[PDB]
Design a protein around this nucleic acid. Sequence first.
DNA 1: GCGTCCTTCGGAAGAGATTCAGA
DNA 2: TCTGAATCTCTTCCAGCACACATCAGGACGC
RNA 3: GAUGUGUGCU
Lengths: 98, 50, 49, 1358, 79
Amino acid sequence: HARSTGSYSLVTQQPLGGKAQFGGQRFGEMEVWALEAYGAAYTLQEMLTVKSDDVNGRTKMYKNIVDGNHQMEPGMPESFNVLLKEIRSLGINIELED
Amino acid sequence: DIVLNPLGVPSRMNIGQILETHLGMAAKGIGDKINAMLKQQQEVAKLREF
Amino acid sequence: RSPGVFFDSDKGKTHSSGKVLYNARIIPYRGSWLDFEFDPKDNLFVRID
Amino acid sequence: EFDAIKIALASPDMIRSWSFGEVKKPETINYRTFKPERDGLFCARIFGPVKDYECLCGKYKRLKHRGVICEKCGVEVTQTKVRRERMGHIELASPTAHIWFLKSLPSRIGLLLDMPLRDIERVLYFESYVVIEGGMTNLERQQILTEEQYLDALEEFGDEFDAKMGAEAIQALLKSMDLEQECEQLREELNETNSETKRKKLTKRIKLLEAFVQSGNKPEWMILTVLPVLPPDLRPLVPLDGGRFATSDLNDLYRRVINRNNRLKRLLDLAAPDIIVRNEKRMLQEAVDALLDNGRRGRAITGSNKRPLKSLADMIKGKQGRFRQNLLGKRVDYSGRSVITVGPYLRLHQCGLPKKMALELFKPFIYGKLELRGLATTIKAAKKMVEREEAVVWDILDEVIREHPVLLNRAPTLHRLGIQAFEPVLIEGKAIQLHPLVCAAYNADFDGDQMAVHVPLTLEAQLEARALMMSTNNILSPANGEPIIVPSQDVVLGLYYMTRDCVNAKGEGMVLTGPKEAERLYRSGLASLHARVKVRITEYEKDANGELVAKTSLKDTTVGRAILWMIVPKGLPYSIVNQALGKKAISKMLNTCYRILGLKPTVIFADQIMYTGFAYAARSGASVGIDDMVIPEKKHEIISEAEAEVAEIQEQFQSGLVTAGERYNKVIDIWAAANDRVSKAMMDNLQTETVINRDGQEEKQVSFNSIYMMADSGARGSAAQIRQLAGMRGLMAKPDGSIIETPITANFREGLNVLQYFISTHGARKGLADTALKTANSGYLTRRLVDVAQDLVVTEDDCGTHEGIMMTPVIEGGDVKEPLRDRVLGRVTAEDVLKPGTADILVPRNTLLHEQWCDLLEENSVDAVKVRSVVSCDTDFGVCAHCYGRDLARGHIINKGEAIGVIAAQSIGEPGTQLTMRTFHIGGAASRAAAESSIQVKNKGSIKLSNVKSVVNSSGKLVITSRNTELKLIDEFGRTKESYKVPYGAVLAKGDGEQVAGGETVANWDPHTMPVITEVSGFVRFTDMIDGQTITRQTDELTGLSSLVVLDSAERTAGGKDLRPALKIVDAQGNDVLIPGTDMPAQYFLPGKAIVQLEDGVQISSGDTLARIPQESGGTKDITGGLPRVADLFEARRPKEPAILAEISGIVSFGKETKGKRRLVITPVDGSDPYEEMIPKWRQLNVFEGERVERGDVISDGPEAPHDILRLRGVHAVTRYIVNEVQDVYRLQGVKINDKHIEVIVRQMLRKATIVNAGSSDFLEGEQVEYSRVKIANRELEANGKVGATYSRDLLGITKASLATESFISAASFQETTRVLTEAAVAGKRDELRGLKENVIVGRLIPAGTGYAYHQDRMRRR
Amino acid sequence: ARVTVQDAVEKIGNRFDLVLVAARRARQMQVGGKDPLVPEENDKTTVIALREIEEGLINNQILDVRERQEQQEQEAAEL
DNA sequence: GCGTCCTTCGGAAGAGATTCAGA
DNA sequence: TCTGAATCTCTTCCAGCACACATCAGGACGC
RNA sequence: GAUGUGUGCU
Ligand SMILES: [Mg+2]
Ligand SMILES: [Zn+2]
Ligand SMILES: [Zn+2]
């Protein structure tokens, strides 16, 4: 099984899970530790933003890749906005500081 | 037809595969003797005896 | 586990001192349970469900 | 964009600011035309339009009307993606209590109002009243009244006196409470009181109050008035086939809450009776508490089939929450997955991607190159051309994949070598070929496992994959300096068959003129591969300053060794292949090649070794038959002899000489004796019993028996497997722990009976279940270790300190466990070491001890060095490079900006997981040691004892009478060469000051039945022991001798609990005997499970066995049972019977006797003497009234608590203790971990310091504040003339040390999300995105590696 | 034409600054029209950047001074 | 067929609430 | 009878990835 | 999308 830019989930803008639907392999919590151990920060940053939850950065990366340009402009994963909204749905108020 | 790896026998002690290999070799030897005695037309006496 | 009565032990780690308690569970095929069990102070405590 | 995250409570004004509308109808999509309802949970008016840029009514359809709001239905037209970024709110009729701030343990409302949780819950669920503003009465502002008491209050005090119930009462209490006055009143109460428990309660409450006042929070904000709702697209109601909808749980909970709220609002205007509206308010409160955190109350509500539906907290906490499932780890595009095969034709930097998979992975690159070449026109045309798979897309795929590495990751990524980067090689097929060398690192066999291939997209990702994660740059294990790309199980067998000689040959005495001629001779069939020839070879050597000077000689070798030498790079000595190369030999060969030549020759050498191992293993045909497993002929004879002995002992059992005890013990021991004799006969018949002809006569050699060949080579197998194949299987015990009386006498070369197989199945099933249901704890340990040490990075170069820990070879009972070379290699020293020419330095002060210097110290026979350590470093928020040491992955100092805190955590955490997922490889054998009973000194030298108390016996020889005795052998040179740890009750053959010859004992003991041997003689009277109550006595009626057994805390009588069984010694006149020099009567306590064979009132000697006690020390001691010890050490749980230490040095004395327990007072000679400790009457105190005790000396005996060590003996002692214990646990299993990682974890454990006095600083009195802030504040103040603040280092386990970090996001994502977020919201904490997990969650570059430069620039720009 | 980058790491000794320097050079060689200083052998931009690092005539200081002299030439080119 | 609606059962550890006993 | 020490009770945790299949979504009542 | 079952490699 292999997956290029395909279909994404609904609540969090992540690639689907499984081979039945066109899904990408999960970069688990243990693999992030192995990427941190090498010090590969740019690889990790692309692993959790530009081929993942990020929406605008993902399409910009796709256009760059089919433009001859290997460059990423990541924003923020949508799963973090989901977390912020789900915390604010309680009585808590979490927000970013300038 | 198949080339296995010998080192998979001693560490995981499934020695039954080697004994099955030898017994199957004996069985195929018996089958080959029967097929050789049956290929060239031979009467029922030799086949029955074997 | 078959319906009936099973006198278990709950050995060891209870009471954090080594005193082994004793319990008597009455499991019916259909209905509520009737757990009898002891106490570290040598007291019998019924426990329904 | 931003630089921090703040979290606090949400005021109703802020909640209304968030909201865009007010839902007041529990109407989702109307089971119809998929349109939102007018004012329902899905609402175009409130949240946003359903379709993109289309108004709900349909008056606008395009972008030309963006920003305007419709008139007919009033839904503003914009992008549909604002349905997941705009919330609403619910105007609750009555106030409602937030369950998080009610049941967080502690309840914030509970200790803010100073009321118990039960009373507040009873008020909050409408079963009692509370009195607010009692007025002119005797009812206080916090008093609780039931229904009848409120009736009495209304009839007796029917004035304006008010007492409400429900959430509004708590809101009134919170709103009408002053905080500054309460805080100062609590300060007065704390300063005037004297106790400790109420002191802790008051300091907790004042901490909460100061946090509330300091932040902008309000206590009345804890009670909800407006309930915000999640945006519709974050709780989607996806339509399925049919008219029904998805089983959403958040929408169902919102439906219930809105229904109950609307019903309550309806009943508020209908003037319903107060009982009904009270019940409905209670139901609304319960529904809101179910929506916030379902199941926090007694019973959780469920939707269908009694499945508790997931609320808002249920999708933020737990393993299936937004932290551990969608933020810390995400599903990833450009990924693949397939089975793996070998394909040994590859190189160390290559893998095989299937040709039909790389087309799907590198698809946008193909689109880009097709558009560049003009073969396509647009993305659609290129996509169609690619999916049609024309004849040129393969010729374009070979250009996008030429030097574009991919990341191959196996599923359990234990350590950092589980993800490596390979340059792809396109192959026809569907299996990802993998180089055979890296299988050891991946732990990837080829029996059906799959690997995941990832594509680095950006330029930096490709450069990181090539420069850091490429497999050619991962030849050294980060755990230890051993190579990780080592030949395994087939290359080893090939090089062992090639490099081995037998005494005969096709041509033996011939003399060869070079390795090339040797290969020509062998391949021509003129001489066997195992000849014994004299080939002329040229071995280069770089003994000069990097210059290769050749030297040719004529060495007596084999043909195979001469062939193998042809691939060895120029620079290695020839005494590296001129042996029988096993696996350790090849590993050391690769290690020396890497240390001498470098990395590129090492990679070339590894590839050549793999090739020439496979080739000459295939050319050998090393099969395995049934004749290879040769059973020794003297096996059934040994079985018959052992069974005759067993029958004799069984007959003796019926004679009454031997009971069911010692008889069972001796029959097990004689079966084990027969087992070792059979195994020794087998392993003596297997290898040396091969008679071969010298062509003059016969002689022996090492066997070519294929089983023994692949056992000796180290390819696959060990002594256990060959013992279980040809010898006897062993003693397979029962699951409880009872060793089976009759061990299995049959092996897997003959059959097994119908019953012996069933006996073996117990151990096999336990060994299979241990992996499956006990690798979870070993995989949770590594997660805790990673989360406690995620924020450690090398942020300096040299902190500049002369401090450091002392490293010495570890010898505590046997030979050198780890020599100094292993324990000190690659660690920067701290002080000039001195040779035995002292006052003459040998190494500089801050030099890295690399391989040359590390053998330059063994030459001078150095015994101890002081090296810089991670735990004793001085930098703030990091570890300096010199204080760490070697990278352990490269042969140099660790480069600045590397996340050592994760490389340490993974290295510590996956010998455990790996060896617990591989337990059933050895079967189910006990692997128990022999439990030796004699100490034989190996070398000849002086004997010295440290802290040993021995007495004189009848024979005059010294006998161990101390618990922590230590025996050490020191040679005639002057260094420690051997040590022994003898137990209590050990007899000695020689003492101190005189050398002992080799081959004789110095210490003998009985491991079982530890004694209570005395020191002074006299008659015995049983003190505080009476039959039946505390002891059970059995007496034979013939001889009339008494025999008693003591009881434990279990069967001891309730009235007998205060009774302490013991032994006292008296003389003939009944007077109390005394120990010479002391005044302590011979009151020897009798511990539990003691068997005494002595009579009352008899004469005994000094130094005789007063009692015998079984030891019950029986266990497998595997890494399954044997790794709660590591977690115990890291979490630092106080042991069941801690050893009492001395807090202060000075003169020792005794105080008030029998104040429930004994009391001891330590009085310093000069300083003040306020210290008195009540020692429990359990154990003997080793300190009497005639010595001087220094702090750190053990008053009692037993395991130490890893907090007293830190408090008294300092930081170096506790870190050395933890390192030694964890390293002993790991070395028992044979796995190797460098101590740097354990020291790193220890440093991450030591971060919280308790203040003693504030001094001139701004810290509180008893506050537990982080060590780094205290240190920087003290450095700032002491730079000026002010005085600093004295502190005290505290030790926290890896769980608490991670929960109590500075950044609340790490603690929230690790464990106990509710309890962390609640405390952070109450305290108004402000995150800084300091460590690595926070930046991973947010989606930025981590401040760890290549992103460290970016983070440094960002920090220095502000 | 590239297997391991140990010598290039020896040239600029951080193994993390090497990644950033090679990234800057390869991005200049890919997006910008700048030409390699070594003869490319049908290799990708990253391999050429690493090879130019190992040839010795590139590092962070060299890249900065080249970019700065190009910037001053560009500023003067406005006339 | 459309359609509107109001069980129990682990175990280990830790924290934090209660109770003992003892001076 | 105040207050440390012991005990009782409630909460949190228990690996990583992957594949296959099925069932579900209110069902009880009015028309 | 969530559950339930079965299975593979550790
Ligand atoms: Mg496998
Ligand atoms: Zn409209
Ligand atoms: Zn340092």
